[PDB]
Design a protein around this nucleic acid. Structure first.
Lengths: 97, 545, 552, 50, 712, 51
RNA sequence: AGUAGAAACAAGGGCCCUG
C-alpha cells in the first residue's frame, strides 16, 4: 500500500477497495468518512454542525448539516452495504415468469 | 431510498428538469400552450387563401398525399411560359466596356508621391518626436527661407493659405505647435459651417415661403475620363529611392530547423528587395503621419495643431571602403494641420490641410484641387521651388487602416512563396532562387510588343497594386473588383477549351460600368482588362473587338 | 472576523431595503445566475480600434484603490502619472490608472514567496513544451501530400473524463466547504482528488483560473482536420510544423506520451473477456458483465475500474462496441465487418432471404438488403467509396496506396454486398463442417467466405475473378485496376475506379442506443449488425501488467 | 442527451429505463414521463431488497 | 512603357492569383428610401392584387400564396408559392431520408425546448425594446419586459421557456399594461402593434455581398418562438448532406469532393457532367412565412399536440409584422445655411415639399402605413430564418421524375442560404438545357428565383462556393481572413497568443505558407508594440512607459526572460506558435520578476472567459465610456447596481458561485444567514473570535431577517 | 531533478520491466533506444556523382 | 470650402463641462 492511494490494498497483485468510514493520521479531510454516513428523515431536534466536527459524532447518531448551497439535510453515521445493481435485476427476472 | 432520491434531485436540478413538467402530480399531467383569444384570431387570419381556418390547413397537410403527375404538369407549364435564355459565350461574345466621358480623374491621395520634394537630416536618438524634428529642420533656416508670393499659378483662396503658412511659421518659432482661431482658419477649417437646426413645432407656412426649405436634392458625383498620369506614378513607384529602411520592421527570432531557416532567408530577400522602392517611403510616411495625427486628435481636440509629414530611413550600405556603418536619416516632405477632431462618432470627419514641397510645375487636369505658389529656390545646384497646397479630411477608420499598411507584404509574400513552392514540388527539388531569378512574368507592352522580367522584380507591381487598393478603396472599387471575377473565370474556361455559357452577360457589363465614376483606379484597371481580353483574343475566343 | 461582521452589517443594510429583500426572499438560489447577466452588459464592435483610441489617452485602465495604498503605489513617480483619485461609473470602487502602473508593479512591487505553482496550473502547456524539447528534427523536403480529412484529438490527456465528473472535481479540490453530496466518481477516485488537492491547498491563488485550467487538462480537443502519416495526439498538437500541402519537415516523435499502448491493452482485455463469455452458451451476457465489473487496471499511478474507462474512450473496435453495449453505453453510428471499417452515407433498405447450394444440393439461407445504399470504407492504408444495389456491387472508387490492401478491401466490400455467383452457387471446397457451429453457434455464409478468403490467397484471386474482367479502354488506363492491384494494365476489372488521394472521411455528431443478443451480435433498431465475435482475431496469449482480474 | 432515455440512463439502470419505456408505449403517453415511472420502479426494486 | 498586371493570367492559372483582386487590404464602406423600395419590391414580386381586411387592425392584407397572376417576365423574381408542390417536395425528401425522420428531429428539439431556461435569450444580437422604442441589447430588454410584467400583475415565478411563452400569449390579451419610466401605461391595440413592430440595423459587419446593407431586429415577444423554429430547422439540416450551412470550412470541402467522386463514378460513358455557380436574388424578399407555416404543420403531424402550437406562432407573427421607418427626411434651403429635420409620422403631412420620386414611392404606401410604421403582411428579412430556407431549398435538389430518367438525366448539388451549386448530367447539350430549365421552373414554383448575371456555368471542375474557388486543387482565398491578423483589442497578455493561434489555424486549413506566417507574426508584433505605447529596452524610444522601463532595467540580469509589454524581445517561431511566451520564458525570468508578474493580489487583473492564455498583471480591463454621464440614462443604472450589490454579496459568502451554478430549495437570505452562522461558530470554536462578537453577529443577522420578512 | 530526456528513459524503463515480465530480455519497439543512439549522429548521404 | 456615399459630417450637452 502507499500513502498516495490510501483506499487500496494490494495482495498477490489483486486489488481490494477499503471502505471510507474512519480516517487515520494520513487521511486529512471528511472525504474518508462519507461512506460511513447516509441521509435519513429530517429531524429539527438534532444539532447543526460543520464538516470538520463531523468526525466527533458517534456511530448511529443523527445530525443536521449544510450541503453545497441553499440546502440543509440530516445525516446519520450508518452505512448501507448494497448498491442498486442487484436489487433491480433480480426483482426484474422474477417478473418474466 | 432517501440517498437515491437525493442524488436524483441534485442531478435534475442540475439539468433544470426539477419542475412539474417532468415531475408532476396526478392532476398536473396535462401541459399545454395557453392558447389565448387574440393569437387564435390572428392565426385564423394569416392562413393562405383557399383555406380560412387553421383547422382546414392542418387537415390538408396532415393528410397530404403525393400526386407526381400534376406536379410534373405544372413544372412543364412553368417551364414553357419562362423561356430561360442560355448563351454560350463562344457564340455570344463579350463586348468591350464603355468608360464614361468628361474631364480627367485628378489626384485624390492626400499626400504627393512623385512630385514630392523632401529635406533630409541626420537623426539623433534623443530627439525623435515630431514636434522636435519639425523644429530641428526649422533652425537651419531653409524651412524659414521660404517666402511665397501673393500670385498663385493656380487654385483659389490664396490669401488664406498664405496667412496660414505665416501663422504656421510663427507658431513653430514659439516652440508651440498651436494656432489661433481667426477668420482665415475658421474659413479653411469650416469651423462655423454646420447648419443651424429649426424645429417643426416652431415652423409655419409663412416661414417656408419666406425661405424655401425644400427637401435636399442630393448631388451625386459626376463622371470623369481615363487618367493618363497613372502609368507614370506606377512606373515611378517601381524604382529605388536612394535609401532603404523606409518601413519599420521587427527582428527575426532564433531558428532550430531547416524550415525556419528557409523562411527567414526568403523573407530577408523579399524585404531587402521591397524596402528600397518609392512606394515604401509613401507607406512609411502615411504610417507615421497618421499615427501622429491620431495621437493628436486623441489628446488635443478642440485645438488647431501642427503636424509634420515626415519619415525615417537609412542610407544604403556601400562596400567596407569609405565610411562604414551607414547612418540614419529623418526626411520631411511637408506640413500637415488638423482642425478640431471632435470625433464624437466613428465615420466622422475632421478637416485637415496639407502644405507640401515640390520642384515640378503642375498640370491643370491632375493637380486640379491644389493651390500652388512659387516659393523660391533650393539646392541639390539651385532650382526653383513650388508649394502645393490643398484641403481634405479623414476619419478614425482611414487612420487605423493606413497605419496598418504592412499587409501588402503579406499578400505579396503569399503569392510568391505559393508559386515557388508549387514549382518546386512538381519536381521534388529546391527550386526557389531559380524561380525568382528565371521565371518570367508579363508586365506590360512597349512598341506594341510584350515585356517581361523575372519575378524578383515583378513583386513590385503586385505591391503597388495592393497599396493602391489600400489607398483608393471605396464602394466603387469594391463593386468593380467583385464583378470582374466572372470575366476571369470565363477567360480560364476559354484557356482550357471548357465550353462556358451564361444567362445574361449584358446585364453583367451594365452592373460593372455602373460603378465606374471619378475613381482613377477603377478606370485604369478597366482599361487594362479591356487590353487583356484584346491581347488574349489573339489566342482565345469569347471576346469581341 | 471584523470582515465577517462587516459582511453581516452590509447584509442587514441591504435587507432593510424592500426590493433587495423581495429578491433575496423569493425563489431559490439559482436566480443568482440570472441576476448575474442583467448587470455589466456592454460590448464593442471593433475592440482593436477602440484599443488604439483609448491607449492613446492618459488613464485608460481601472484598478483597485486599497490594494494600491497597501502596496504603497505612489503617483507621479518621476513626473510620469500612474493614477489619480476617481471612481469609475460601473464599479464605483475602482480608480483610473495607466499602463505604466503595470510596469511599476512588475519592477518595484510586492513579491510573493514562491510561484512554482504555476507549473501545475498550466501543466498541459508545460507538457507541450517538454514534448517539443525531446524531439530530434530532420531534413526538409518538398513534394505533394495526400492529406485526408477526419475527426481526431489534438490534446494528449490522461484519464479523460466527462463534464459532470468535473464540475464536482473542481469543488473537492478548491472550494470544498460548499461541496455537494459525494458522487460515486469521488468515492471511487479518492487518490486522484487527494493528489489534485495536495498542490492547490493552503496557497494564495485565484480559483476560477485554476478551474478553467483543470477543464483544459481534462478536455481532448477534437477537430476535423486534414492529416497525413500516423495519427497520434502528440503530433496533431504541432502538425502545423511537420508538413503541409507541398512541404514536409521530417521528425521522429514515436517515443513520447505512451498513449496508444493503453488503448491496445484495453482492447486486448476486452477481446479476452468477450471470448471468455462466448465460452458460455446461455448467459454470456451476465457472464460478460460480471467479468467486466470484477476487473480493474492501473493508469499511471491510480487504479481505475474497467467499466469506467470503457465509457470514456472512443475506440471504434468490434470489441469495445460489445462491452459499451452491455453496459448500456451509447455510441456512434459506425459499422465493422471483420478488420475493415465502414460508415453509411445515404440510402436505406431492409432484410431479404435467399439461399445457396454448398455442395451439390444443400440449401442454406443467406440474407441481403433490398435497396440502394452508399458506404465509405477504410482498410489499412486504403480508402474506398462504393454503392450496393440489390445483391450487387454497383460501383466503387479507391484512393489507397498499396496493391495488397487494395485487393483485400475490394474483396471484403464485394462480400459485404453479396456480389458474385459464389453467393449463388458456393464452391466445392467448402463443406458443412466449415459451414458453422464450432460447438453449436451458427455462422452466416458471409463470415464463412471471409475466413475462406483469409485462409488462402488463391481463394481471393478466384473471388476477384468472379468480378467481371474487360479490356482497359483508352484514357481510363490510369483509372483502372488489374488483378494484382496495378494502377494500369491492358485488361482490368469491371466497374472500378482508382485515383491518387485518399477519400475525405465523413462526419456526424450523432449517438444511438443499441442492444445485443445472447450470441454477442449487436443490433441498431433494425436487422443490421454493427459488431460480432467473428470479426476479431481468433486468439492470442498475453501477459497483462498492472491489472486486477478479481474473479474466479 | 438528445433524448430523455439517454438522460435517465445517467443515474438509473438501463433495465428500469427500458421497462418504463415499454410501459409508456403500452399507454402511448408522452415519453417525457420516462423518468418518474423509472424512479418509482427502481424504488420498488430497492424496497424489496431481497 | 504601359503596365498591365492582368497579363500574368495568361502563362498562369486564375485561381492561384484570384486573391490579388480582393481589395480587403483597405477600409470597407459604410434609412427610409431603402426600406420603402424594399416594401415596394416585396408588394410587386407578389404577382397578384387580391386583398382582404383585417378585423383586428382594419388594414388591407395582400395575400400571396397560391394566388399567382401576371405571368409575364417570369425570369424576374416572384414571391408566390403553390403549397402543393412544396408539400410534394417535402414528401420526396422524407422518402429519400426514410420514415420517422421529421418526427425524430422534432423529438430531439422538444428534448431541449422544455428544459431550457428563459435566461438564454440574453445571448444574441440587439433587439428592439417595446417601451422606449429603441435598439438595446437583449439582456436589458428582457429585464424591462420582466419588470413590466411584475409591476402590472405580479412577479414572474417562471424559470423555463414554456412559462415565458404562455405569459407572452396572455399579455397579448390584456387590456392595460404598466412599465417603468421617468410609469406610463398603454392599451391593448397599441401594445400589440408595438410588439409586432420590427426595427432595422445598418451594421452588415461582413463585406460579403454589398447588397446586404441592413439586418432585422425584432422585439422580445418573437425571440423564443424563433429560437424553437431555428432549433428544429437545425436538427433537420444537420442530418442532410446537401446542406452546408451549420458546418464550416473543411466539412463542406469534403462534402463537395465526395459528391464529385460519386458523380464521376455514377455517370456512364455516354454521359457528361456540368457545374453551375448560383447566387439567388431577393432571398429575404421571396421566402414566405405562410409556406413555412404549412410546412411546419405537415412536419408536426405525428408528434405531440404541444409542438404543433409553438412552431405555429412565429409564422403568423411574421405574417402580421410591422416595419419601422428611420430618421425621416431632411429639409433645407438653397444656400443650405438652415436645415430642418422631420420624422416619418410627419412625411404624410409635408408630402408636397419632397422630390417627385419620394412622392411616387410614398403615396402608394399611404394606406398600408400607420404612425411611423407600415403593415407588411408577408415577405421576410435578413438573418431571421436561414436554416429553414436552406431546408426549403434542398428539397429541390432531391427532385426526380419519370421524364428526367426517360432521357437519362439527373441533377444534384449543394446549397446554402441564397448560394448554391448545381451538378447536372445528361447525354447531350439539348438535354442539359432542358434539365436546367426544369430545375429553374421547380425552383420558381416556391419563390426561389435565380440571378442570371451573377450565375454562370462551365465544364465539371470549375466553380466557386462562398468565396472558395474550386478546381483540381483548392485555392484558399487567404484574403477572407486578412483582418484577423490584427490585435483583438482586449489586453496585452492575450492578443499575442490569439494572433499566434489564428496563424496556426491558417497554416493548417488555409495552407498558409511558412514565410508568410513569419511575416504576419512580425507585423502583429510591431502593431502590438505600437498600440500599447511600448518598445524594447535596447531601443532609444522615449515616452511614459519607456522612461520607468529604462529606469528599473538595471535590476535585471537576463532580458531574454522579459515580456514584450515590459521591454522584451521576441522568442517564438513556427514550431512555437502553440505556446504562449509567458510559458516559454518562465525558466529564465529573474526569480524576483517571476514572483512579481505572477501574483494573485493585483489591482488590475480581471477575468473575461477561446481564452487560451495566461493570467498576470497585464490582463487588465479598459476604462468605461462616459457619454451617458450627461444623458439622463441613470435611473436604469439603479436597478443594475442593486442586482450587482446582491450578486457580489452572495458571492462574498459562497466563493464558488461562478464556477458551479447555485441550486437548492432555499432563498438567498436563508442560505446567507445559515452560512454566516456556520462560519461564526467554526471560527469562535478555534479561530480569533469572542463570544461578544458572535452574539453581536447573531443579533444583527436575526434583526436583518426580521426586517426582510417584515418589509413585505 | 536534473536531466535532459527524462521521458525516453522513463518509457524505456517501463519497457524493460515489461520485457522481463515476458521472460524475454528482448525489446521489440524501437523508438526511444533508436533516438538515444542516434542523438550522437544521424543524417542522410548524397552521392558525389549526384552533386 | 471640403469629405464621402448611394447618407452623413462640417461638435454636443447643460457662461461651464465631455468624446
Amino acid at each position: 500500500w502507499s500513502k498516495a492511494d490510501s483506499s487500496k490494498i494490494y495482495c498477490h497483485g489483486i486489488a481490494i477497495r477499503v471502505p471510507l468510514v474512519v480516517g487515520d493520521e494520513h487521511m486529512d479531510t471528511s472525504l474518508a468518512l462519507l461512506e460511513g454516513f447516509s441521509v435519513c428523515e429530517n429531524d429539527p431536534r438534532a444539532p447543526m454542525v460543520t464538516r470538520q466536527d463531523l468526525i466527533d459524532v458517534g456511530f448511529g447518531q443523527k445530525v443536521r448539516l449544510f450541503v453545497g448551497q441553499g440546502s440543509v439535510r440530516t445525516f446519520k453515521r450508518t452505512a448501507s452495504q448494497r448498491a442498486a445493481s442487484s436489487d433491480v435485476n433480480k426483482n426484474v427476472k422474477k417478473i418474466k415468469m | 431510498i432517501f440517498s437515491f432520491l437525493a442524488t436524483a434531485a441534485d442531478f435534475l436540478r442540475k439539468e433544470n428538469m426539477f419542475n412539474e413538467i417532468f415531475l408532476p402530480d396526478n392532476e398536473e399531467t396535462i401541459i399545454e400552450m395557453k392558447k389565448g383569444k387574440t393569437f387564435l384570431e390572428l392565426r385564423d387570419e394569416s392562413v393562405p387563401l383557399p383555406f380560412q381556418t387553421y383547422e382546414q390547413m392542418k387537415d390538408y397537410c396532415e393528410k397530404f398525399k403525393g400526386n407526381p403527375r400534376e406536379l410534373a404538369s405544372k413544372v412543364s407549364q412553368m417551364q414553357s411560359n419562362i423561356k430561360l435564355p442560355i448563351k454560350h459565350y463562344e457564340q455570344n461574345k463579350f463586348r468591350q466596356i464603355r468608360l464614361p466621358k468628361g474631364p480627367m480623374a485628378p489626384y485624390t491621395h492626400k499626400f504627393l508621391m512623385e512630385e514630392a520634394w523632401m529635406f533630409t537630416k541626420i537623426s539623433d536618438p534623443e530627439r525623435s518626436r515630431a514636434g522636435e524634428i519639425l523644429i530641428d529642420f526649422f533652425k537651419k533656416g531653409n524651412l524659414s527661407a521660404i517666402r511665397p508670393k501673393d500670385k498663385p499659378l493656380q487654385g483659389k483662396y490664396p490669401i488664406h493659405y498664405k496667412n496660414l503658412w505665416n501663422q504656421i511659421k510663427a507658431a513653430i518659432a514659439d516652440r508651440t505647435m498651436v494656432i489661433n482661431e481667426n477668420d482665415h482658419s475658421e474659413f479653411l477649417g469650416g469651423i462655423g459651417r454646420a447648419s443651424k437646426k429649426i424645429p417643426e413645432i416652431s415652423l409655419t407656412q409663412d416661414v417656408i415661403t419666406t425661405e424655401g426649405l425644400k427637401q435636399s436634392e442630393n448631388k451625386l458625383p459626376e463622371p470623369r475620363s481615363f487618367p493618363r498620369w497613372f502609368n507614370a506614378e506606377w512606373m515611378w513607384a517601381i524604382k529605388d529611392s536612394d535609401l532603404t529602411g523606409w518601413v519599420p520592421m521587427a527582428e527575426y527570432p532564433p531558428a532550430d530547423n531547416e524550415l525556419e531557416d528557409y523562411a527567414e532567408h526568403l523573407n530577408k530577400t523579399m524585404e531587402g528587395v521591397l524596402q528600397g522602392t518609392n512606394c515604401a517611403r509613401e507607406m512609411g510616411k502615411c504610417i507615421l503621419t497618421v499615427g501622429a495625427l491620431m495621437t493628436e486628435c486623441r489628446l488635443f481636440p478642440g485645438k488647431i495643431k501642427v503636424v509634420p509629414i515626415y519619415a525615417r530611413s537609412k542610407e544604403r550600405k556601400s562596400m567596407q571602403e569609405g565610411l562604414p556603418v551607414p547612418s540614419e536619416m529623418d526626411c520631411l516632405f511637408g506640413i500637415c494641420v488638423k482642425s478640431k477632431s471632435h470625433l464624437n462618432k466613428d465615420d466622422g470627419m475632421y478637416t485637415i490641410i496639407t502644405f507640401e514641397f515640390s520642384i515640378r510645375e503642375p498640370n491643370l487636369e491632375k493637380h486640379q484641387k491644389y493651390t500652388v505658389f512659387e516659393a523660391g529656390h533650393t539646392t541639390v545646384r539651385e532650382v526653383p521651388l513650388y508649394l502645393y497646397c490643398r484641403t481634405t479630411a479623414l476619419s478614425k477608420i482611414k487612420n487605423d487602416w493606413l497605419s496598418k499598411a504592412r499587409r501588402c507584404f503579406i499578400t505579396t509574400m503569399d503569392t510568391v512563396e505559393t508559386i515557388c513552392l508549387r514549382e518546386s514540388a512538381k519536381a521534388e527539388e529546391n527550386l526557389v532562387e531559380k524561380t525568382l531569378n528565371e521565371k518570367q512574368m508579363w508586365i506590360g507592352k512597349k512598341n506594341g510588343e510584350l515585356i517581361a522580367q523575372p519575378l524578383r522584380e515583378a513583386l513590385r507591381v503586385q505591391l503597388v497594386q495592393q497599396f493602391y487598393f489600400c489607398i483608393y478603396n471605396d464602394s466603387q472599387l469594391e463593386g468593380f473588383c467583385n464583378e470582374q471575377k466572372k470575366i476571369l473565370m470565363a477567360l480560364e474556361g476559354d484557356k482550357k477549351n471548357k465550353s462556358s455559357f451564361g444567362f445574361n452577360p449584358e446585364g453583367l457589363l451594365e452592373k460593372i460600368e455602373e460603378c465606374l465614376i471619378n475613381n482613377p483606379m477603377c478606370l485604369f484597371m478597366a482599361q487594362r482588362l479591356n487590353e487583356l481580353v484584346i491581347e488574349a483574343s489573339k489566342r482565345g475566343a469569347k471576346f469581341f473587338k | 472576523m471584523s470582515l465577517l461582521l462587516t459582511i453581516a452589517k452590509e447584509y442587514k443594510r441591504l435587507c432593510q431595503d424592500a426590493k433587495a429583500a423581495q429578491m433575496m426572499t423569493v425563489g431559490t438560489v439559482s436566480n443568482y445566475t440570472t441576476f448575474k447577466k442583467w448587470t455589466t452588459s456592454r460590448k464593442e464592435k471593433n475592440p482593436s480600434l477602440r484599443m488604439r483610441w483609448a491607449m492613446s489617452s492618459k488613464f485608460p485602465i481601472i484598478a483597485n484603490k486599497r490594494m494600491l495604498e497597501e502596496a504603497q503605489i505612489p503617483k507621479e513617480h518621476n513626473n510620469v502619472a500612474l493614477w489619480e483619485d476617481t471612481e469609475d461609473v460601473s464599479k464605483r470602487d475602482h480608480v483610473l490608472a495607466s499602463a505604466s502602473c503595470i510596469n511599476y508593479w512588475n519592477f518595484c512591487g510586492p513579491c510573493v514567496n514562491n510561484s512554482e505553482v504555476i507549473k501545475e496550473v498550466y501543466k498541459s502547456r508545460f507538457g507541450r513544451l517538454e514534448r517539443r524539447k525531446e524531439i530530434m528534427w530532420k531534413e526538409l523536403r518538398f513534394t505533394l501530400v495526400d492529406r485526408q480529412r477526419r475527426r481526431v484529438d489534438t490534446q494528449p490527456v490522461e484519464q479523460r473524463l466527462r463534464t459532470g465528473e468535473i464540475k464536482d472535481l473542481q469543488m473537492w479540490t478548491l472550494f470544498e466547504d460548499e461541496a455537494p453530496l459525494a458522487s460515486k466518481f469521488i468515492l471511487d477516485n479518492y487518490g486522484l482528488v487527494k493528489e489534485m488537492r495536495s498542490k492547490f491547498a493552503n496557497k494564495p491563488l485565484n480559483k476560477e483560473v485554476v478551474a478553467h485550467m483543470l477543464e483544459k487538462q481534462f478536455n481532448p480537443e477534437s477537430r476535423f482536420l486534414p492529416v497525413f502519416g500516423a495519427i497520434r495526439p502528440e503530433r496533431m498538437e504541432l502538425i502545423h510544423a511537420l508538413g503541409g500541402e507541398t512541404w514536409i519537415q521530417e521528425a521522429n516523435t514515436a517515443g513520447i506520451s505512451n498513449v496508444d499502448q493503453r488503448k491496445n491493452d484495453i482492447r486486448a482485455v476486452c477481446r479476452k473477456v468477450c471470448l471468455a463469455a462466448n465460452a458460455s452458451i446461455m448467459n454470456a451476457k451476465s457472464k460478460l458483465v460480471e467479468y467486466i465489473k470484477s476487473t480493474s487496471m492501473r493508469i499511471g499511478e491510480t487504479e481505475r475500474k474497467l467499466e469506467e474507462l470503457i465509457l470514456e474512450t472512443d475506440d471504434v473496435s468490434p470489441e469495445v462496441t460489445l462491452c459499451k453495449s452491455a453496459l448500456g453505453g451509447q455510441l456512434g453510428k459506425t459499422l465493422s465487418f471483420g478488420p475493415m471499417l465502414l460508415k453509411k452515407i445515404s440510402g436505406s433498405g431492409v432484410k431479404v432471404k435467399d439461399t445457396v447450394y454448398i455442395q451439390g444440393v444443400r440449401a442454406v439461407q443467406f440474407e441481403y438488403w433490398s435497396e440502394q445504399e452508399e458506404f465509405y470504407g477504410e482498410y489499412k492504408s486504403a480508402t474506398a467509396l462504393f454503392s450496393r444495389k440489390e445483391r450487387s456491387l454497383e460501383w466503387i472508387t479507391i484512393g489507397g496506396g498499396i496493391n495488397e490492401d487494395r485487393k483485400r478491401l475490394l474483396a471484403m466490400c464485394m462480400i459485404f454486398c453479396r456480389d458474385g455467383d459464389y453467393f449463388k452457387d458456393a464452391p466445392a471446397t467448402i463443406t458443412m463442417a466449415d459451414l458453422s457451429t464450432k460447438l453449436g453457434r451458427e455462422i452466416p455464409y458471409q463470415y464463412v467466405m471471409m475466413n475462406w478468403i483469409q485462409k488462402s490467397e488463391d481463394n481471393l484471386e478466384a473471388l476477384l475473378y468472379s468480378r467481371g474482367i474487360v479490356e482497359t479502354n483508352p484514357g481510363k488506363m490510369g483509372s483502372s485496376m488489374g488483378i494484382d492491384g496495378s494502377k494500369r494494365a491492358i485488361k482490368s476489372l469491371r466497374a472500378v475506379t482508382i485515383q491518387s488521394g485518399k477519400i475525405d472521411m465523413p462526419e456526424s455528431k450523432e449517438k444511438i442506443h443499441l442492444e445485443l443478443s445472447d450470441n454477442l451480435e449487436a443490433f441498431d433498431s433494425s436487422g443490421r449488425i454493427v459488431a460480432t465475435i467473428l470479426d476479431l482475431p481468433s486468439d492470442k496469449k498475453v501477459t497483462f501488467q498492472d491489472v486486477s482480474f478479481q474473479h474466479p | 442527451s438528445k433524448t430523455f432515455a439517454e438522460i435517465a440512463e445517467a443515474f438509473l439502470e438501463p433495465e428500469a429505463v427500458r421497462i418504463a419505456k415499454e410501459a409508456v408505449e403500452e399507454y402511448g403517453d408522452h415519453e417525457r414521463k420516462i423518468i418518474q415511472i423509472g424512479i418509482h420502479f427502481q424504488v420498488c426494486c430497492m424496497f424489496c431488497d431481497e | 512603357m504601359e503596365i498591365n498586371p492582368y497579363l500574368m493570367f495568361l502563362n498562369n492559372d486564375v485561381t492561384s492569383l484570384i486573391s490579388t483582386t480582393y481589395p480587403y487590404t483597405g477600409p470597407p464602406p459604410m434609412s427610409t428610401k431603402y426600406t420603402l423600395e424594399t416594401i415596394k419590391r416585396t408588394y410587386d414580386y407578389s404577382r397578384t392584387s387580391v386583398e382582404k381586411t383585417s378585423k383586428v387592425f382594419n388594414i388591407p392584407r395582400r395575400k400571396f400564396c397560391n394566388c399567382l397572376e401576371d405571368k409575364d417576365e417570369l425570369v424576374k423574381p416572384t414571391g408566390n408559392v403553390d403549397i402543393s408542390s412544396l408539400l410534394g417536395l417535402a414528401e420526396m425528401m422524407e422518402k429519400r431520408m426514410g420514415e420517422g425522420f421529421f418526427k425524430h428531429c422534432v423529438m430531439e428539439a422538444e428534448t431541449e425546448i422544455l428544459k431550457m431556461h428563459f435566461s438564454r435569450l440574453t445571448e444574441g444580437r440587439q433587439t428592439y425594446d417595446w417601451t422606449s422604442e429603441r435598439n438595446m441589447p437583449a439582456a436589458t430588454a428582457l429585464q424591462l419586459t420582466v419588470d413590466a410584467i411584475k409591476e402590472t400583475e405580479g412577479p414572474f415565478k417562471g424559470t423555463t421557456m414554456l412559462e415565458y411563452c404562455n405569459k407572452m400569449i396572455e399579455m397579448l390579451d390584456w387590456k392595460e399594461i404598466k412599465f417603468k419610466k421617468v410609469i406610463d401605461s398603454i392599451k391593448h391595440d397599441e401594445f400589440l402593434i408595438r410588439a409586432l413592430t420590427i426595427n432595422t440595423m445598418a451594421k452588415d459587419g461582413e463585406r460579403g455581398k454589398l447588397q446586404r446593407r441592413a439586418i432585422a431586429t425584432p422585439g422580445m415577444i418573437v425571440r423564443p418562438f424563433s429560437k424553437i423554429v431555428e432549433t428544429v430547422a437545425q436538427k433537420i439540416c444537420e442530418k442532410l448532406k446537401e446542406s452546408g450551412l451549420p458546418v464550416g470550412g473543411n466539412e463542406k470541402k469534403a462534402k463537395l469532393k465526395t459528391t464529385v467522386t460519386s458523380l464521376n463514378a455514377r455517370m456512364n460513358s455516354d454521359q457528361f457532367a456540368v457545374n453551375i455557380t448560383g447566387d439567388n436574388s431577393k432571398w429575404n424578399e421571396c421566402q414566405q412565412p405562410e409556406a413555412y407555416l404549412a410546412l411546419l404543420a405537415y412536419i408536426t403531424k405525428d408528434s405531440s399536440d404541444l409542438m404543433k402550437d409553438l412552431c405555429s406562432v412565429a409564422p403568423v407573427l411574421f405574417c402580421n409584422k410591422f416595419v419601422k421607418l428611420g430618421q425621416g427626411i431632411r429639409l433645407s434651403n438653397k444656400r443650405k445655411t438652415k436645415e430642418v429635420i422631420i420624422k416619418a409620422e410627419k412625411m404624410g403631412k409635408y408630402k408636397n415639399l419632397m422630390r417627385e420620386e419620394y412622392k411616387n414611392l410614398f403615396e402608394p404606401l399611404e394606406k398600408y402605413i400607420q404612425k411611423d410604421v407600415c403593415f407588411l403582411p408577408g415577405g421576410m428579412l435578413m438573418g431571421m430564418f436561414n436554416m429553414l430556407s436552406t431546408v426549403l431549398g434542398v428539397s429541390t435538389l432531391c427532385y426526380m421524375d419519370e421524364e428526367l430518367k426517360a432521357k437519362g438525366c439527373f441533377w444534384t448539388g449543394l446549397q446554402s442560404s441564397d448560394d448554391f451549386v448545381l451538378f447536372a448530367v445528361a447525354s447531350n447539350w439539348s438535354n442539359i438545357h432542358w434539365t436546367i430549365r426544369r430545375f429553374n421552373a421547380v425552383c420558381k414554383l416556391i419563390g426561389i428565383n435565380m440571378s442570371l448575371e451573377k450565375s454562370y456555368g462551365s465544364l465539371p471542375e470549375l466553380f466557386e462556393f462562398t468565396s472558395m474557388f474550386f478546381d483540381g486543387e483548392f485555392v484558399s482565398n487567404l484574403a477572407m481572413e486578412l483582418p484577423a491578423f490584427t490585435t483583438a483589442g482586449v489586453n496585452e497578455g492575450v492578443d499575442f497568443t490569439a494572433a499566434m493561434s489564428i496563424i496556426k489555424t491558417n497554416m493548417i486549413n488555409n495552407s498558409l505558407s511558412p514565410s508568410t506566417a513569419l511575416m504576419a507574426l512580425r507585423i502583429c508584433l510591431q502593431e502590438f508594440r505600437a498600440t500599447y505605447r511600448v518598445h524594447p529596452w535596447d531601443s532609444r524610444v522615449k515616452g511614459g512607459r519607456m522612461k520607468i522601463i529604462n529606469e528599473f532595467i538595471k535590476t535585471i540580469e537576463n532580458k531574454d526572460g522579459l515580456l514584450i509589454a515590459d521591454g522584451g524581445k521576441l522568442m517564438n517561431n513556427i514550431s512555437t506558435l502553440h505556446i504562449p511566451e509567458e510559458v516559454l520564458k518562465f525558466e529564465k525570468m529573474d526569480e524576483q520578476y517571476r514572483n512579481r508578474v505572477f501574483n494573485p493580489k493585483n489591482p488590475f487583473t480581471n477575468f473575461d472567459k477561446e481564452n487560451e492564455a495566461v493570467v498576470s498583471t497585464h490582463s487588465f480591463r479598459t476604462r468605461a465610456n462616459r457619454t451617458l454621464l450627461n444623458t439622463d440614462m441613470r435611473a436604469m443604472m439603479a436597478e443594475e447596481k442593486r442586482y450587482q450589490m446582491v450578486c457580489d454579496m452572495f458571492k462574498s459568502v459562497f466563493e464558488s458561485a461562478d464556477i458551479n451554478p447555485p441550486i437548492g430549495a432555499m432563498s438567498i437570505g436563508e442560505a446567507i444567514e445559515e452560512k454566516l452562522l456556520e462560519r461564526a461558530k467554526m471560527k469562535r470554536d478555534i479561530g480569533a473570535i469572542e463570544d461578544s462578537e458572535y452574539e453581536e453577529i447573531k443579533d444583527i443577522i436575526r434583526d436583518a431577517k426580521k426586517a426582510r420578512l417584515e418589509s413585505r
